[PDB]
Design a protein around this ligand. Structure first.
Ligand SMILES: *[C@@H]1O[C@H](CO)[C@@H](O)[C@H](O)[C@H]1NC(C)=O
Ligand SMILES: *[C@@H]1O[C@H](CO)[C@@H](O)[C@H](O)[C@H]1NC(C)=O
Lengths: 78, 49, 107
């Protein structure tokens, strides 16, 4: 139940059935540079640096929060 | 929020709905009281859009 | 003000009752029917709006409950579990009132 306000919801709803989110078979792979982000306001060339910041842990597991529906919305999603 | 291939980023004090959801193809038939996921009726006070 | 009647207030098994709304107002945002004396949405049954003319269901929609434009709720098969209280929610200008409660019995 995110938020606090009751709204005119123009979709169907049903608390029929829910599951755990499908924790994906893919794991976070950083060897292709995915997961990183460029340093602001600097350029390095032909080098290798030990930097820091905020980053994903390698080898952990993703999550699929992309719920889906056609016209009804599960109440136990929230 | 992606809309029309641009990003509608807005760090803004929205009164977020209790049953939020977006749509691929939303349509409102001129009904100005409907909100998809937030029902502010005033301009919400914020810093960037 | 708004008044709600069960016709009949005592219904036999598997028959029809009409949750007849009287003196409902006009410029409503939406309305929905609520099982029990609660306003948590998992007891909301069916939600129909006046200004876009679409109806949508809740979690407790057993499938045999017809919602009308005058706010009335028509039952098809009265079950023994459906004895109890029912509350009719109305909303206007992002403000709400839950002051329409009704209770019947089955024999
Ligand atoms: C940004 O893009 C949206 C498209 O949904 C448009 O409505 C809006 O006017 C654009 N400009 C600003 C300043 O938000
Ligand atoms: C209300 O919903 C039912 C399906 O649950 C549908 O058959 C009926 O036509 C709807 N009422 C109106 C007035 O559209």
């Amino acid at each position: 139940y995110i938020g606090d306000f009751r709204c005119i919801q123009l979709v169907n709803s049903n608390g029929a059935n829910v599951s755990a989110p499908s924790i994906s078979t893919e794991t976070v792979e950083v060897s292709q540079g995915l997961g990183t982000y460029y340093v602001l306001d600097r350029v390095y060339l032909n080098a290798t640096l030990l930097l820091t910041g905020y980053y994903p842990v390698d080898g952990s597991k993703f999550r699929n929060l992309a719920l889906r529906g056609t016209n009804s919305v599960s109440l136990s999603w929230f | 929020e992606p809309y029309n291939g641009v990003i509608m980023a807005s760090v803004c004090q929205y009164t977020i709905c209790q049953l939020p959801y977006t749509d691929c193809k939303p349509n409102t038939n001129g009904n100005k009281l409907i909100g998809f996921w937030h029902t502010d009726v005033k301009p919400p006070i914020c810093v960037l859009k | 003000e708004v008044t709600i009647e069960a016709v009949p207030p005592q219904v036999a098994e598997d028959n029809n009752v009409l949750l007849l709304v009287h003196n409902l107002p006009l410029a409503l945002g939406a309305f929905a029917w609520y099982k029990g004396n609660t306003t948590a949405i998992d007891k909301e049954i069916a939600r129909f709006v006046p200004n876009s003319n679409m109806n949508f269901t809740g979690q407790a929609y057993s499938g045999r409950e017809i919602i009308y434009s005058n706010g009335s709720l028509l039952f098809q098969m009265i079950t023994m579990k459906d004895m109890g209280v029912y509350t009719l929610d109305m909303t206007d200008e992002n403000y709400r009132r839950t002051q329409a409660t009704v209770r019947f019995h089955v024999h």
